[PDB]
């Protein structure tokens, strides 16, 4: 009572700060941008009133009610009409919560009625449904209107109000609902699961249930990595006047954050200068910098850079489509770093979905039906390739996938669409992704005296659907062995600067993020003797963060093909296709088709993107032709 009034007074004092002005300005912006939720940083509250912050974090529901009442009063003070516009104003929290930073494993009963910040992966989402807040009813006979308020266990002030609408007045005269005058709010439920890398040994990850209401709905979709700030509550229930004493617990969100680069003017200037510095060296340097811990497979790295940059998809006025996504296949001998390159792309690309041939199915790749959590409605859940829409799917052990499962990949690889015709569902799903696949030859170890087609053991149509195919061979050469051995041993000797000698990597880890914003760019990575060697360092390495920003900026450019590039590409395609037995030893790894011409155009466009050029010039076309020439032919040894 008196404590609630004092808390409301304190919160009103906190938001009226013109006498530094951060929250007075924030509320003005809230009004201007047509919002009804203000995000408050608990660090400022802690600075100005420590006791009020501790109470807010430890007695969450009452303190949040007082905070929201104070916010409504303040907004009304700035502008009364706007305050009348909205039923309620909400408060979200951010900053550092100390020990309240938890995961779904560490979120225990001791955090009940507290504000917590949870970090995890979204596994399940639900449909948005309306929830009645205030009901308005009219009496035609008596010409008067009556209002009703509803609340449940999920509201800030929990009370189990009745769901039945009024139907008649105290007088027998009947009542009719004014739906356009009533108030409803959106409601959704999600599940957040522990990050698998953080789980203890042998343990499947734990999960927690979260409730999103109002604006927070649809802020997260399955597959996202999120940070949710909310309040922890138990939902007690009874049946037949009996309670089991065991209660479900939910997190009632007040803020949802994602874990889209943010660009400062200095970074933009750095990117522009980097693009301007060299004409031909940008692409080569970027490709050299891709996966530093792997000794060079230089052409493969250039191809992977092209895949990350991509081409430009064409939409024609008639409605026909030409894809811009570049697909790559790597077939190789054991232990040539195929899986490591796939893992690097998984770690670096903005949207990358891992998959194994033996551990995946067509259903799991495309989409699955099941009963809706509510009403038991036949609903669809996205598979790997739909989750990878406008992203990358990395398929390891591609040769192990079943033929029937493999066939489901053709339509996505070529057209970019998934057709679902099952369980009384007819849908066309967008799966516009780039496929990066790794495989072994039929005999495990490539037989140089057999032909590429006999070693690869795949149908010509599937091979045709791949923009580039790379045969990676392990040839015992003493000089190459020396270089690779030096690189590998240097990698294994490395010790990160923070760690001490003798330290062992733990299996699992506690929560390390202690704030919503990370308390912690340079173009070139700082030289390390072990990571780079004692060589004179003539070749410089671009840093990971700068590479991530630069590739993001370049992916948005759409280079336009020019007449000279088109002429060169056409002539080179004619030469590639006409040439039969161009070298008598030489054999074609994949057939040359009009898809090869489209691949040339795609690679040239990606190269032009790397330079941040608005036009595709002859140098880009030459690079694409060089890549295709390297990839499409292999010498066959004669015994």
């Amino acid at each position: 009572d008196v404590e609630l009034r004092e808390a409301q007074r304190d919160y009103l004092d906190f938001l009226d700060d013109e006498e530094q002005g951060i929250y007075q300005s924030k509320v003005r912006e809230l009004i201007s941008d047509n919002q009804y939720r203000l995000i408050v940083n608990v660090n400022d509250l802690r600075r100005k009133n420590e006791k009020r912050a501790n109470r807010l974090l430890n007695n969450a529901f009452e303190e949040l009610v007082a905070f929201q009442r104070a916010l409504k009063d303040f907004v009304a003070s700035i502008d009364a009409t706007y305050a009348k516009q909205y039923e309620e104003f909400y408060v979200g929290l951010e900053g550092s919560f100390g020990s309240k930073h938890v995961s779904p494993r560490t979120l225990t009963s001791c955090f009940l009625s507290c504000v917590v910040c949870v970090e995890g992966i979204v596994t399940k989402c639900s449909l948005v449904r309306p929830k009645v807040v205030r009901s308005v009813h009219y009496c035609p006979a008596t010409k008067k209107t009556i209002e009703r308020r509803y609340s449940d266990l999920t509201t800030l002030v929990a009370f189990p109000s009745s769901s039945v609408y009024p139907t008649k007045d105290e007088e027998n005269n009947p009542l009719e609902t004014e739906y356009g005058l009533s108030v409803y709010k959106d409601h959704q439920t999600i599940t957040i699961q522990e990050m698998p890398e953080k789980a203890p040994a042998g343990q499947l990850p734990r999960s927690v249930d979260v409730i999103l209401d109002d604006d927070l709905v649809d802020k997260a979709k399955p597959g996202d990595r999120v940070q949710v700030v909310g309040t922890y509550r138990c939902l007690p229930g009874k049946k037949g006047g009996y309670t089991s004493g065991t209660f479900r617990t939910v997190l009632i969100a007040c803020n949802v954050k994602q874990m889209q680069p943010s660009f400062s003017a200095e970074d933009i200037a750095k990117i522009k200068k980097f693009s301007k510095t060299r004409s031909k060296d940008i692409f080569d340097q970027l490709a050299k910098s891709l996966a530093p811990s792997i000794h060079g497979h230089d052409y493969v790295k250039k191809a992977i850079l092209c895949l990350l940059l991509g081409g430009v998809e064409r939409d024609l006025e008639n409605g026909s489509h030409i894809r811009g996504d570049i697909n790559i296949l790597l077939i190789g001998d054991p232990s040539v770093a195929k899986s490591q390159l796939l893992r690097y792309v998984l770690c670096t690309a903005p949207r990358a979905i891992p998959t194994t041939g033996r551990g995946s199915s067509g259903v799991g790749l495309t989409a699955a039906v099941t009963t809706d959590q509510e009403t038991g409605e036949r609903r669809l859940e996205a598979g790997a390739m739909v989750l990878a829409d406008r992203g990358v799917v990395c398929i390891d052990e591609f040769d192990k996938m079943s033929d029937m499962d493999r066939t489901a990949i053709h339509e996505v690889m070529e057209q970019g669409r998934v057709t679902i015709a099952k369980a009384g569902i007819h849908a066309r799903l967008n799966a516009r992704c780039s496929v990066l696949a790794a495989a072994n030859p039929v005999y495990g170890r490539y037989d140089q005296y057999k032909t590429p087609m006999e070693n690869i053991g795949l149908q010509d149509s599937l091979l045709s659907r791949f923009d580039l195919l790379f045969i990676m061979l392990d040839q015992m050469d003493p000089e190459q062995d020396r270089e690779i051995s030096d690189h590998v041993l240097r990698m294994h000797r490395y010790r990160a600067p923070g760690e001490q000698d003798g330290d062992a990597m733990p299996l699992g880890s506690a929560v390390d993020i202690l704030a919503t914003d990370d308390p912690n760019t340079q173009i070139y990575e700082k030289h390390d003797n072990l990571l780079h060697g004692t060589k004179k360092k003539k070749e410089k390495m671009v840093s990971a963060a700068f590479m991530k920003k630069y590739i993001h900026v370049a992916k948005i450019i759409k280079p336009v093909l020019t007449q000279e590039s088109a002429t060169y590409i056409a002539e080179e395609y004619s030469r590639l296709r006409s040439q039969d037995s161009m070298s008598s030893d030489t054999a074609r790894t994949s057939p040359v088709t009009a898809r090869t011409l489209e691949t040339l155009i795609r690679l040239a466009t990606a190269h032009a993107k790397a330079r941040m050029s608005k036009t595709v010039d002859l140098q880009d076309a030459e690079e694409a032709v060089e890549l295709v020439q390297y990839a499409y032919f292999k010498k066959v040894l004669e015994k």
């Binding site: 309306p130 009645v132 739906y179 006025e317 045709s464």
Partner: protein
């Protein structure tokens, strides 16, 4: 607000609103319809909110905020105005009127319906943007119809009669469920009977339930399309079918639970859209007069290069040949084509084009669907991609369609036959499909791409231009748009040309010539008696483009021999 003033204002708008008609230039748009409703030549009245906006935008805003209220207000205004607009007696009185002639709720005598035609200022939404802030408001939503229900009767007013006192009782209904009355409430029965529902004295309305879906191109990245439920009543029924693209104006409302299920369920509710308006979404002679066959064929997928004769064959599959014998007996006209070739020769692009052009069609893949598309493609085209990837069960279905033009199903011994009168356009990669299936195709085209410098140079020049400009390189004759190509195809299909007696000997001479070559070739050609019937089928299709003449037989012959190479 006091609703009496609003009712008076609605009456005013209905009465004195006049709009410049095409000819009259001053007509009362809604007074005439009120006259028609009074005389019962019309059932449904559609109020366009643009007209209301012209006079007073505030009332349009009020209607859009609280639409279900203003629907009742407009209905009451119309019901009160109807007597004043009546001129003569109603010509014909049906069962309800006879019952009436032989207190009543105001809705028992109502025989019209009132709907709103949403304002042009309210731009349409996708099903996602219809959220909790729209509950009880008038919104316009776009989508694809995926399911429709048979029209059924829904009770609006239930009428009872007491067996003892013979009085009449009425029970207006405004819920998905209701509580029937049992015991008579009349004074006579109360001072000292059972109520029984009288179907003849009750008022029903046509009812229909349908599901809508989001357009694929509008779904956000990495999401699944959402769906909404639309409830349709009265004169808005039988408008939407599965597959059509519709724009639905209606009211977004929650579904009312009933019984103990009110108590158990919390504050959450399911929703639906209450439908108010459903909207489905001599130069010409000169184009038909000269070289029109070459022009139309060249217009098939202009972004593809070099498949001139295949494109000509696909045009015949679109017109489809004559369906009747000279005496009116039904015969099979549908033409089946299979494109066999090596990868990357635009087979899938050509099939994708034909699906978009065909008015009724279904595109399927060898493994994208199994164990239905044929039924939806009845009287249409079924594009079967990856034709050699299907299972035996799928193969048997296709075989029976090319034979009987029907699909037979057996639900645990309960047989049923569905119409499958569709054309089959198949694409396959050479390995091994059974010969029993290949001989059924009228045209078997083997697309082989042998490398050649000049042709490869020309193809590359075409493709690079398309990537450079997002359209085909210019040619002497401009391709025709799909909107315009579907008109000529439909117009041609109306004709039913016949083959004369005279050509009998000539067509026979061609058949033996084809047979002799097949025996001499010693290849696996499928020239049989079935080939003779194929000459007639193609010949009549060619005429339907242009009574069959010798020039159509020559083109049909040439197209076929070019196919067998």
């Amino acid at each position: 607000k006091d609703y009496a003033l609003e009712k008076e204002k609605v009456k005013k708008f209905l009465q004195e609103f006049y709009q410049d008609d095409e000819l009259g230039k001053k007509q009362f748009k809604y007074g005439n319809q009120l006259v028609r409703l009074a005389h019962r030549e019309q059932v449904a009245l559609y109020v366009d909110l643009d007209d209301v906006a012209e006079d007073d935008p505030e009332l349009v805003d009020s209607i859009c905020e609280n639409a279900r209220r203003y629907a009742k207000l407009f209905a009451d205004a119309v019901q009160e105005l109807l007597p004043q607009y009546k001129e003569r007696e109603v010509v014909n009185k049906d069962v309800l009127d006879v019952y009436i002639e032989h207190q009543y709720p105001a809705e028992l005598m109502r025989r019209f319906e009132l709907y709103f035609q949403g304002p042009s200022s309210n731009k349409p939404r996708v099903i996602r943007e219809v959220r909790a802030d729209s509950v009880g408001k008038l919104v316009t939503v776009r989508g694809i119809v995926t399911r429709v229900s048979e029209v059924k009767p829904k009770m609006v007013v239930a009428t009872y009669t007491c067996d003892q006192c013979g009085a009449e009782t009425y029970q207006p209904i405004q819920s998905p469920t209701f509580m029937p009355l049992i015991m008579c409430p009349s004074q006579e029965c109360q001072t000292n009977g059972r109520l029984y529902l009288q179907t003849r004295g009750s008022r029903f309305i046509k009812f229909q339930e349908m599901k809508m879906q989001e357009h694929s191109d509008q779904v956000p990245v990495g999401n699944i399309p959402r769906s909404i439920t639309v409830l349709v009543e009265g004169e808005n029924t039988r408008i939407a079918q599965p597959g059509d693209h519709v724009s639905v104006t209606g009211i977004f409302l929650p579904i009312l639970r009933t019984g103990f299920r009110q108590v158990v369920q919390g504050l959450l509710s399911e929703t639906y859209l209450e439908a108010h308006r459903i909207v489905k979404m001599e130069e010409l002679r000169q184009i038909a007069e000269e070289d029109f066959y070459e022009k139309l064929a060249a217009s098939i997928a202009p972004e593809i290069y070099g498949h001139e004769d295949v494109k000509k064959a696909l045009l015949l599959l679109l017109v489809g040949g004559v369906d009747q014998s000279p005496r009116g007996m039904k015969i099979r006209g549908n033409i089946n084509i299979c494109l066999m070739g090596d990868p990357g020769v635009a087979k899938s692009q050509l099939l994708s084009y034909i699906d978009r052009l065909a008015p009724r069609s279904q595109y399927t893949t060898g493994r994208g669907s199994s164990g239905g598309a044929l039924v939806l493609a009845d009287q249409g085209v079924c594009c079967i991609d990856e034709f050699d990837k299907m299972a035996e069960a799928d193969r048997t279905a296709i075989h029976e369609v090319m034979e009987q033009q029907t699909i037979s199903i057996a639900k645990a011994g309960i047989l049923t036959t569905l119409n499958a009168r569709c054309s089959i356009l198949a694409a396959a990669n050479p390995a091994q499909l059974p010969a029993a299936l290949l001989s059924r195709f009228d045209l078997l085209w083997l697309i082989q791409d042998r490398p050649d410098r000049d042709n490869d140079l020309r193809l590359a020049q075409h493709i690079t231009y398309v990537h450079q400009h997002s359209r085909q390189p210019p040619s002497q004759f401009e391709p025709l748009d799909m909107k315009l190509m579907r008109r000529y195809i439909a117009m041609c299909r109306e004709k039913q040309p016949m083959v004369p007696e005279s050509l009998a000997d000539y067509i026979t001479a061609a058949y033996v010539e084809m047979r002799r070559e097949a025996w001499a070739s010693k290849d696996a050609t499928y020239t049989s008696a079935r080939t003779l019937l194929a000459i007639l089928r193609l010949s009549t299709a060619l005429a339907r483009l242009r009574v069959v003449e010798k020039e159509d037989v020559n083109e049909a012959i040439r197209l076929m021999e070019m196919s067998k190479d």
